[PDB]
Amino acid sequence: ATVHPERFEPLLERSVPRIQPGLSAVRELLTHQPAFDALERFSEDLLLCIFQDMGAFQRAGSAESAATLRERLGVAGRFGRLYDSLLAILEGAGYLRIEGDRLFTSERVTPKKHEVERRMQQLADLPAIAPYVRLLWACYRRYPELLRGQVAATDVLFPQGSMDLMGPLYKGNATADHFNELVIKSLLVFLDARVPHLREGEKITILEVGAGTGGTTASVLEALSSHARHLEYFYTDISHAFTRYGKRQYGPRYPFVTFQPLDLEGDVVAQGFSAERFDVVLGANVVHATKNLRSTLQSIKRLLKANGWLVLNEMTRVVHFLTLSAGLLDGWWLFEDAAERMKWSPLLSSPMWKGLLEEEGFRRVAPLQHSDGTSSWSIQNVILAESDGVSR
Q: What does this protein do (predicted)?
């Protein structure tokens, strides 16, 4: 075990209240819950429609073998577990009764084709959910191909290589922007606390993991750019291509950024990153894409200074929207530690992230609060955690 020296005092406890959104912001986010509830129900209905388009579950009172059907529909081997999850979504919606391998269509099963297309248009008229509706509809149109593995998921989710569908998901809609802003706020609160105590020429070093094509990184770098003189920011991704394209896009305007590949599942020092180099590690919707979460967290602890922060932006409920979309991608199914995750997912709820990060030796672990009486936002959260400086 490696124990880093403590080079500055713990600062997370007194920072959490400066980041925690107030009631008015929380209420404003919660105005979007009826739309996201309707998105969930729509996903159920859309899913029934996808099976019907493939010649399954067209009528109430019919029985199938799950195992036989999978084979008959042509589901790709790498989608076995997605397929089981899709059956349970139908079961939870009241469309299937499931008894072991036996599937029975219920009375709620009717022809969904026309209904779902009308519902799609209605839900597309709600801005907070519109880009999610758009993405599900694009997947819907090609779903039988997707599920049979006859077309790559990235060709549908990134049409003609573009960000036309994914881009609007990650930013420019209310819920994504709320959380994007909470990450930025966290970083600026950190900087405000530390900058005053820096020695001459000393810098604060932030690592972003899984920066991808940098969609959310753009606004981070702009918010940070006034601290440029005491900041180094590492833009990293498993993909060397993605880091190169990020350098092209952002390097000229933000000379404080270093662009370097990083695979946290490998040996971080072998990859050119030293122990206790980083004041902050940021992971925006990517740290869950790993085979072993505990191990990935320990590598983060190796990279972080003692009392350095991990800042996560994570989806914290296995919503049907994600299962249907993100569930088609390898990163969703990479996990080899199912008992640490929510079922049929790589995701953790806020309480699960809190307990796990504590077990791995973070302190002051703070999933931010988004509750107003009996209502609360559980679909997504920003989670802050302070490293104790111990790494296996």
A: Involved in production of the polyketide antibiotic thailandamide.
